[PDB]
Amino acid sequence: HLVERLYLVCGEEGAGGGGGSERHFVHQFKGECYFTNGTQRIRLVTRYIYNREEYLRFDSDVGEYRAVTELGRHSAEYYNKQYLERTRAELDTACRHNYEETEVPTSLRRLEQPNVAISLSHNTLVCSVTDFYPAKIKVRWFRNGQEETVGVSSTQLIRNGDWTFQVLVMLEMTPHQGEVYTCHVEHPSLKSPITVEWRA
Amino acid sequence: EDDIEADHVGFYGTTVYQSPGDIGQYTHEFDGDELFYVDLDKKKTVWRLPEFGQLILFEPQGGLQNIAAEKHNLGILTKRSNFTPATNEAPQATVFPKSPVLLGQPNTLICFVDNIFPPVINITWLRNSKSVTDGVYETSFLVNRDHSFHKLSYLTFIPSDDDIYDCKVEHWGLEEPVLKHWEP
Numbered sequence: 001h002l003v004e005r006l007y008l009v010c011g012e013e014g015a016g017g018g019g020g021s022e023r024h025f026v027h028q029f030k031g032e033c034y035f036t037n038g039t040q041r042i043r044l045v046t047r048y049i050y051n052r053e054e055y056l057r058f059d060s061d062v063g064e065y066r067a068v069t070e071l072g073r074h075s076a077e078y079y080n081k082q083y084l085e086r087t088r089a090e091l092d093t094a095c096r097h098n099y100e101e102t103e104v105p106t107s108l109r110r111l112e113q114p115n116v117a118i119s120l121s122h123n124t125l126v127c128s129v130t131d132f133y134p135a136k137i138k139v140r141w142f143r144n145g146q147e148e149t150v151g152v153s154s155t156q157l158i159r160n161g162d163w164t165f166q167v168l169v170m171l172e173m174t175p176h177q178g179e180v181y182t183c184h185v186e187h188p189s190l191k192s193p194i195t196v197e198w199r200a
Numbered sequence: 201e202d203d204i205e206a207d208h209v210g211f212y213g214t215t216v217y218q219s220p221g222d223i224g225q226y227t228h229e230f231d232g233d234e235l236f237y238v239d240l241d242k243k244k245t246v247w248r249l250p251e252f253g254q255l256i257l258f259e260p261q262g263g264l265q266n267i268a269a270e271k272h273n274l275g276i277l278t279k280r281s282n283f284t285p286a287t288n289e290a291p292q293a294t295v296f297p298k299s300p301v302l303l304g305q306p307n308t309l310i311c312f313v314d315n316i317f318p319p320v321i322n323i324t325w326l327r328n329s330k331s332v333t334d335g336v337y338e339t340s341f342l343v344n345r346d347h348s349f350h351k352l353s354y355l356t357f358i359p360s361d362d363d364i365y366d367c368k369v370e371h372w373g374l375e376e377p378v379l380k381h382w383e384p
């Protein structure tokens with residue numbers, strides 16, 4: 001009882017209208033489904049791009065194809081004649097279907113627990129939080145049982161490309177005998193936080 | 201030039217085609233990560249992680265359909281643009297480990313390459329200035345909001361005190377290969 005992932009159809013322009021040293025010419029189509037509060041709100045945006053210029057767009061909040069630049073002026077009239085009702089219908093048959101029937105049992109159930117380690121690198125403690133999914137996470141620093149607000153800094157969220165993330169969170173500190181510093185990580189994969197302590 | 205607000209975003213999917221050379225790709229993404237690509241020559245769906253395809257299918261014909269339509273659209277738009285060619289961009293790389301580096305414990309070195317356009321590139325690895333091809337994997341070209349691409353390459357490695365690494369990137373937009381260095 002395999003379930004099928006569906007796709008957004010790339011519409012074709014009407015014809016006859018109106019290598020490091022070689023020239024190249026590039027075209028792109030992007031079909032984007034935006035979801036909020038499950039499938040309670042869905043927005044569909046499809047984009048047609050020549051080289052780097054998006055020239056034609058369907059946006060379900062607008063309800064029809066529109067020219068994004070002058071290059072797409074007559075494209076939008078042709079696509080609205082030929083593909084308008086088909087594209088409107090893809091919000092349910094493609095976006096809603098993929099979310100409810102394929103993302104709910106897979107992507108949205110994926111939970112990878114973070115690994116947490118502390119290193120010292122005047123000075124600064126670095127808490128490395130690695131290999132977690134999804135991206136939502138909270139990392140807190142404590143000194144002798146009290147939470148630190150500064151100097152707490154963080155790198156950007158790092159996307160590893162393998163459906164995991166990592167982040168580094170730094171604490172400006174001066175070591176004294178014999179304090180305890182704690183990196184404290186809350187993540188949807190964890191019922192209770194993971195903590196690591198570091199001592200002078 | 202303003203984000204759309206959403207809890208989740210699926211790309212179902214993204215297609216790119218370029219001429220000459222008949223080079224194209226078709227992928228789906230969810231929340232910015234690759235679900236699969238369609239091997240257009242083999243006509244088969246290749247999942248990013250094998251588990252993704254255990255309960256779910258994608259018919260490769262959908263990717264073939266999008267690529268055929270994009271080849272058609274490219275012909276029309278190329279003429280309409282007065283045959284304006286693509287601009288070769290200079291890609292930029294950063295290298296980082298997947299996990300904190302521990303002596304003798306297998307790890308993965310990641311070469312993140314951004315500002316790729318057109319989507320043709322070579323990313324390769326050096327260890328102690330010698331080419332390494334064992335244990336190397338690459339993502340598809342992943343889309344950027346400005347319609348360039350990024351790509352990641354992966355190198356299995358075992359951290360030691362006697363190894364130096366480089367990610368090497370070759371691209372039409374680079375006069376000479378760029379080397380991104382990394383050491384523990």
Ligand SMILES: *[C@@H]1O[C@H](CO)[C@@H](O[C@@H]2O[C@H](CO)[C@@H](O)[C@H](O)[C@H]2NC(C)=O)[C@H](O)[C@H]1NC(C)=O
Pocket residue numbers: 019320321322370371372
């Ligand atoms: C990626 O690497 C390949 C292989 O080194 C390059 O293809 C070679 O290109 C040289 C010079 O252009 C040719 O003389 C060889 O015959 C090619 N070899 C093969 C096996 O095709 C390719 O050009 C590189 N790509 C980029 C973007 O630099």
Ligand SMILES: *[C@@H]1O[C@H](CO)[C@@H](O)[C@H](O)[C@H]1NC(C)=O
Pocket residue numbers: 037038039040
């Ligand atoms: C989320 O959606 C459900 C049903 O789709 C609705 O009943 C609920 O009120 C929504 N929550 C918010 C905060 O809008």
Ligand SMILES: *[C@@H]1O[C@H](CO)[C@@H](O)[C@H](O)[C@H]1NC(C)=O
Pocket residue numbers: 282
């Ligand atoms: C098209 O390109 C040619 C050659 O680059 C140029 O002479 C011409 O002015 C351009 N514009 C039009 C409308 O032909």
